């Protein structure tokens, strides 16, 4: 295994949280975005005309993605194509963290570059609740 991520803002949920890095550098600061559509990242975001590319001078985008329906590596690949700088997969149930693994089936696996991590449903819901309230959610990854 378990690593760390730091929600730097807002104050309501800021702090250090456990996470499990995907089984597939330096410090990285980004801003969290929960997409309106395609929340499980099983289809291409360009089908929805959704991009996570950051405008010049602004924080890179960490996309929050729900667990389910497709492989974790496809989620990371689809988010990477949409321009995300990292992917956080919120677990679909409240349980201990698991290590996202390669599909084994039975590339693009050698072409996945963005950092990947699975977080708890509790932290996933807390992040979504802060974004729904109108606050930006910033985060620091030191892996």
């Amino acid at each position: 295994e378990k690593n760390n991520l730091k929600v730097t803002s807002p104050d309501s949920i800021k702090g250090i949280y456990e996470c499990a890095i995907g089984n597939f550098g330096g410090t990285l600061v980004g801003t969290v975005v929960y997409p309106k559509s395609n929340q499980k990242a099983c289809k291409s975001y360009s089908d929805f005309d959704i991009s996570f590319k950051s405008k010049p001078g602004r924080l890179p985008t960490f996309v929050l993605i729900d667990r389910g329906d497709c492989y974790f590596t496809l989620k990371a690949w689809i988010a990477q194509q949409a321009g995300a700088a990292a992917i956080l997969v919120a677990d679909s149930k409240a349980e201990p963290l698991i290590t996202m693994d390669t599909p084994e089936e039975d590339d693009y696996l050698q072409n996945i570059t963005i950092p990947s991590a699975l977080i708890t449903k509790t932290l996933g819901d807390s992040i979504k609740s802060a974004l729904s309230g109108g606050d930006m959610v910033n985060m620091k990854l030191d892996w």
Binding site: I98, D101, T102, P103
Partner: peptide, 5 residues
């Protein structure tokens, strides 16, 4: 605990 999906 390890899983692919």
């Amino acid at each position: 605990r390890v899983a692919a999906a």
